[PDB]
Amino acid sequence: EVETFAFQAEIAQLMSLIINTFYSNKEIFLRELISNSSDALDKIRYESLTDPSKLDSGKELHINLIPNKQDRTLTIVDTGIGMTKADLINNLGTIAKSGTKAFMEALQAGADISMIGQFGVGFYSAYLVAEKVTVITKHNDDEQYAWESSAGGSFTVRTDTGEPMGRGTKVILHLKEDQTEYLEERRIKEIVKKHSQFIGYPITLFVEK
Amino acid sequence: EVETFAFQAEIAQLMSLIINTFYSNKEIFLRELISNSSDALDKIRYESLTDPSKLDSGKELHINLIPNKQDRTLTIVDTGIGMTKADLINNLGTIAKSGTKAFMEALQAGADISMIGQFGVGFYSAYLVAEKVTVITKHNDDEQYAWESSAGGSFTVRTDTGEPMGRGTKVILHLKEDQTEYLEERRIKEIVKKHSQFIGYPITLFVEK
Ligand SMILES: CN(C(=O)c1cc2c(C(=O)N3CCCC3)[nH]nc2cc1O)c1ccc(N2CCOCC2)cc1
Ligand SMILES: CN(C(=O)c1cc2c(C(=O)N3CCCC3)[nH]nc2cc1O)c1ccc(N2CCOCC2)cc1
On whether the CB atoms of residues B30 and B38 are closer than 8 A, the answer is no
Name every chain A residue with its beta carbon within 8 A of the beta carbon of B86. Answer: 49-50
Q: Check CB contact of A91 with chain B, cutoff 8 Å.
A: yes
Amino acid identity of residue A99, one-letter, is G
Q: Which of B205, B165, B182 is nearest to B40 (CA)?
A: B165
On whether the CB atoms of residues B91 and B6 are closer than 8 A, the answer is no
Q: Is A34 in the pocket of ligand 1 (CB under 6 A)?
A: no
Distance CA B149, CA B88 (A): 12
Q: Which of B51, B74, B48, B73 is nearest to B61 (CA)?
A: B48
On whether the CB atoms of residues A79 and A62 are closer than 8 A, the answer is yes
Atom of ligand 2 nearest to the CA of B35: 27
Q: Which of A66, A43, A70 is nearest to A185 (CA)?
A: A66
Distance CA A149, CA A151 (A): 5
Length of chain B: 209
* Structural domains of chain A sorted by starting position, each given as residue range(s) with its CATH number in brackets: 1-209 (3.30.565.10)
Torsion angles phi and psi, residue A141, rounded to 5: -85, 5
Distance (angstroms) between ligand 1 centre and the Cα of B178 equals: 43
Q: What is the per-residue burial (b if ≥16 Cβ within 10 Å, else e) of A132-169? A: bbbbbbbbbebebbbbbbebeeebbbeebeeeebebbb
Q: Do A200 and B102 touch (CB under 8 A)?
A: yes
C-alpha distances out from residue B40 to A9, B55, B170, B202, Å: 27, 13, 12, 14
Distance in Å, alpha carbon of B33 to nearest chain A alpha carbon: 16
Q: What is the 3-state secondary structure (H, E, C) of chain B?
A: CEEEEECCHHHHHHHHHHHHCCCCCCCHHHHHHHHHHHHHHHHHHHHHCCCHHHHCCCCCCCEEEEEECCCCEEEEEECCCCCCHHHHHHHHHHHHHHHHHHHHHHHHCCCCHHHHHHHCCHHHHHHHCEEEEEEEEECCCCCEEEEEECCCCEEEEEECCCCCCCCEEEEEEEECHHHHHHHCHHHHHHHHHHHCCCCCCCEEECCCC
Distance CA B153, CA A21 (A): 52
What lies within 8 Å, CB to CB, of A18 at 6+ separation is: A113, A124, A125, A127, A128
Task: Give the SS3 label for residue A78.
Answer: strand
* Atom 19 of ligand 1: nearest residue by CA position: A37
C-alpha distances out from residue B137 to A23, A41, B62, B128, Å: 44, 25, 15, 22
Q: Is B40 in the pocket of ligand 2 (CB under 6 A)?
A: yes
Q: Starting from the CA of residue A41, give the closest ligand.
A: 1
Experimental method: X-ray
Distance CA B190, CA B179 (A): 16
Sheet containing strand B73-78, strands side by side: B2-6, B154-159, B144-149, B130-138, B168-175, B73-78, B63-68, B203-205
* Atom 11 of ligand 2: nearest residue by CA position: B123
Q: Are strands A130-138 and A144-149 parallel, antiparallel or unpaired?
A: antiparallel
Q: What is the 3-state secondary structure (H, E, C) of A5-50?
A: EECCHHHHHHHHHHHHCCCCCCCHHHHHHHHHHHHHHHHHHHHHCC
Distance (angstroms) between ligand 1 centre and the Cα of A81 equals: 10
Distance CA B186, CA B189 (A): 5
Amino acid identity of residue A148, one-letter, is E
